[PDB]
């Protein structure tokens, strides 16, 4: 970051700076970057889990322009307004992040079936949604949650929601927030450095889920990039105060 | 800082910068970016063996290719751009002694200093901005405007006054070291020789008077303030 007061050489008289409005309305300050990143963002809104697959993959990365919808492109399972959230706009300014993320997963059920959430560390790939690992047609005898990796279970009859905190299990000092083109086929090891692992949800029977994401307490951002080129048309969908 | 009355050699109140066996003077004032830190602590873990410095070679000033600014150039246009260290090894100043340690060592950490010297006449006017983007590989075509440059560590050059600019560049990379050279035996899975990008952009177009010069030139100079090398190997030609 460069403040730019360096370039301001003028030292002539000016009007008063006044008094801040911070604290006047309430003490609930919402200016802290970490506080903004720690409140949740909806990734997946009522998406299906299918037991024919290994599970629904969630790549461990914060919300950003990487998950932004553009009118015309192919339809994904992602929430369309991820790119327009405050924290996504903030993450578009910082290309480095380190620490844990927290995932709030809600299973749309009240059944006694256990739904397992398995953490995969940084393996070098980057996938999302339902996937058959090594293209098999049977995963009940070889579940991902019973392979050895760290796992937690949801029992909807007790509690359909859970909040799980995924560690920074990677080789790199920082995780890369975004690329210029997310679908470009470049150097394969660099391609996978935008995630720190995966979170895999596996059901017993067919059931829907919703997924939110936020930053952990142990979390930092760095490598300030400044604001990008942007567009808006908010004016057009509202009346003015003069009819 | 303060000018004097005219004498035999004009207003002799110049300043200068001496680094190793290289000196660069300046007629007017200079703008300097903030001295900001690099990642420290990972060096001792990432390399089991000790790292090496070659200050006499690396910490000297070395000029690179000339930049031409014209009246045709619009705001936001790239005058030049540099992927570092790659472009200072195998594109610009290839025969520089600054590049000698990169032949043998495979890894390194690099903090740079880049001086810019402009020479436009007093009847011209214009603004140029130089900025740095850390760990820019596959993110050069976004956050790449004049506005992004004004936000990131930068220097501003007025084309009439000919004020000098010094950009201090720390090592801010997602890995412990950056790879120095590609090789036929080495992997293609990792992009080497690029931990940052430097952009030289038009902030306000060059303008001139009636029957005036339609262009003027800027010359960049580079040096390593802290170049630590690791992983000794057999010497190779650079790219």
């Amino acid at each position: 970051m460069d403040t730019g007061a360096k370039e301001d050489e003028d030292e002539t008289a000016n009007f008063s700076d006044g008094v801040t409005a911070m604290g006047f309305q309430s003490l609930d300050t919402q200016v802290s970057i970490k506080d903004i990143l720690r409140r949740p963002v909806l990734l997946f809104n009522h998406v299906e889990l299918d037991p024919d697959y290994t599970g629904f993959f969630i790549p461990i990365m914060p919300p950003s322009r990487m998950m932004q919808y553009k009118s015309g492109d192919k339809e994904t399972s992602f929430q369309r307004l991820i790119g327009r959230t405050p924290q996504a706009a903030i993450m578009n300014l910082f290309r480095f992040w380190r620490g844990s993320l927290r995932y709030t997963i809600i299973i749309h059920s009240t059944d006694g079936h256990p739904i397992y959430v398995t953490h995969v560390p940084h393996t070098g790939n980057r996938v999302y949604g339902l996937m058959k690992v090594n293209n098999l047609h049977e995963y009940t005898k070889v579940p991902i949650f019973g392979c050895g990796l760290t796992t937690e279970m949801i029992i909807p009859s007790v509690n359909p929601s859970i909040c799980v905190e995924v560690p920074f299990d990677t080789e790199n000092n920082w995780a890369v927030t975004f690329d210029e083109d997310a679908q470009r086929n470049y150097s394969w090891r660099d391609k996978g450095d935008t995630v720190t692992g995966h979170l895999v949800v596996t059901p017993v029977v067919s059931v829907y889920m919703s997924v939110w994401v936020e930053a952990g307490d142990d979390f930092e951002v760095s490598n300030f990039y400044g604001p990008p080129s942007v567009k808006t048309n908010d004016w057009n969908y509202a009346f003015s105060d003069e009819h | 800082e303060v000018p004097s009355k005219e004498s035999i050699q004009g207003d002799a109140t110049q300043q200068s910068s001496k680094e190793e066996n290289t000196i660069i003077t300046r007629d007017q004032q200079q703008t300097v970016s903030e001295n900001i830190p690099s990642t420290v602590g990972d060096l001792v873990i990432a390399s089991s063996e000790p790292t090496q410095q070659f200050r006499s070679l690396t910490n000297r000033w070395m000029p690179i290719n000339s930049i031409r600014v014209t009246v045709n150039g619009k705001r936001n246009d790239l005058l030049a751009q540099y992927y570092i260290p790659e472009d200072f090894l195998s594109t610009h100043a290839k025969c520089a002694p600054n590049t000698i340690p990169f032949e043998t060592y495979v890894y390194g950490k690099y903090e740079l200093e880049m001086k810019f010297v402009a020479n436009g006449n007093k009847f011209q006017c214009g603004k140029v901005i130089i900025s740095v983007k850390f760990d820019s590989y596959q993110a050069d075509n976004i956050n790449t405007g004049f506005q992004a440059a004004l936000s990131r560590p930068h220097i501003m050059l007025d084309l009439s006054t000919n004020n000098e600019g010094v950009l201090k560049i720390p090592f801010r990379y997602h890995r412990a070291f950056v790879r120095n050279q590609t090789h036929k035996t080495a992997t293609a899975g990792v992009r080497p020789g690029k931990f940052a990008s430097i952009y030289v952009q038009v902030l306000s177009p060059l303008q001139t008077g009636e029957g005036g010069a339609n262009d003027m030139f800027i010359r960049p100079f580079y040096r390593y303030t802290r170049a630590e090398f690791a992983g000794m190997s057999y010497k190779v030609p650079l790219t």
Binding site: Q183, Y186 | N76, L78, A80, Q81, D87, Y137, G145, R191
Partner: peptide, 26 residues
């Protein structure tokens, strides 16, 4: 095919990104 996969030869370097020589990208 998908045009995002590979960059055209005239604007790019060997590592499938915009060349430093290619100033017109902006």
């Amino acid at each position: 095919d998908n045009p995002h996969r590979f960059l055209p030869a005239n604007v790019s370097n060997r590592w499938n990104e915009y060349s430093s020589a290619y100033l017109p990208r902006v």
